[PDB]
Every structure is written in C-alpha cells, then in structure tokens.
C-alpha cells in the first residue's frame, strides 16, 4: 500500500530546481520510503498505546512518536496544519 | 496541496500494524502533512548527490546515499539497500 505516485512525484518535483528531472525508479523508491515512514511512526505509537492500555491511536500519540524518533521538528508544522484544517 | 493526499490510503497503511485497533480522525491528517515534509527533505538531500555526480536526473542511488548519510533516515536502511 502506497500513496499515489503522481502525488509523490509532484511533491518531489517542487523540491528540486525547475530544470531537474526525476527518474521513475526514484519516484517509486520515495513512494516506498513514505509508506515505511508511516508504518515506522505508527509502530512506535501503537506499542505505546498498547502499553498504556488505550484502544485509539490519537494525534498526540503520532506526534510523540515522531518527537521520540528524531522528527521533533515536524510537531509544530503538523499542529498548525491540523488546526487550520479544522478551522 | 496536502489535502489531495487520500486519507483512506494513509489509514490503510496504519492498519497493517498488528497492534492498531482504532485510529483517531486526526491521525491520517497529521500523516498527510508529515508525508509532504518527509518527501521534500528526502528529495532535497538526495539531490545533493545528483549534483555532486554532475547529473540533472535524480536517481534511486542518490536516495540510497542520502539515507546512509542522515541519522533521521536510518529507518530506511532496508527499504533502499
């Protein structure tokens, strides 16, 4: 299970200079990496929820897993995105 | 826009986890934005190796090199060998 390749490729293209090109196998590689990112963070959150005897993975569990595993810089932009999403 | 990412697909990936019971509504939304941040940073770091090799086409080996060089990407060790 992967996010749509066209969405992944669009985000990749926005990151590199306008004259750059991205090979199809690089797009497919990043598609795989994204899914592993989601599963890696989810595994950390799910083990914590299990230990704490809770049945629902909440947003705080995801953000805390990111903070623990080296993605603390994501916490503030994610909170802002979700809040703007809810407004 | 990050809103274009399908939340059902993100939820499906989460649900592969053997210990996931129920998922909050906000969890896939957070992952949608995180996916954009992650793709952008991984792509930029790989592009360092594209240019260092005098190329203008980003290739899979560039991603592999970026993963080895950044501690935050250690978890991709088996994905891009």
């Amino acid at each position: 299970i992967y996010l749509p390749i066209a969405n992944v490729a669009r985000i990749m293209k926005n990151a590199i200079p306008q004259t750059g090109k991205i090979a199809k196998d690089a797009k497919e590689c990043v598609q795989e990496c994204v899914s592993e990112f989601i599963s890696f963070i989810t595994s950390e959150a799910s083990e914590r929820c299990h230990q704490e005897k809770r049945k629902t993975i909440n947003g705080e569990d995801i953000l805390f897993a990111m903070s623990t595993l080296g993605f603390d810089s994501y916490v503030e932009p994610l909170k802002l995105y979700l809040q703007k999403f809810r407004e | 826009r990050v809103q274009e990412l399908p939340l059902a697909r993100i939820k499906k990936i989460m649900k592969l986890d053997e210990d996931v019971k129920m998922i909050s509504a906000e969890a896939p939304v957070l992952f949608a934005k995180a996916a954009q941040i992650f793709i952008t940073e991984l792509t930029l770091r790989a592009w360092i190796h594209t240019e260092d090799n005098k190329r203008r086409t980003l290739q899979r080996n560039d991603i592999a090199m970026a993963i080895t060089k950044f501690d935050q990407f250690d978890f991709l060790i088996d994905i891009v060998p």
Binding site: E36 | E18, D74, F75
Partner: peptide
C-alpha cells in the same frame, strides 16, 4: 534513537 523501532519493523515486515 531509531534502532529499537527499526529492529521491530524488520520483524513486522517479514510477516
């Protein structure tokens, strides 16, 4: 900081 989660994910992907 990722090591123990990496080891665990390898086991999950094998299944």
């Amino acid at each position: 900081k990722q090591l123990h989660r990496i080891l665990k994910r390898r086991q999950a992907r094998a299944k």
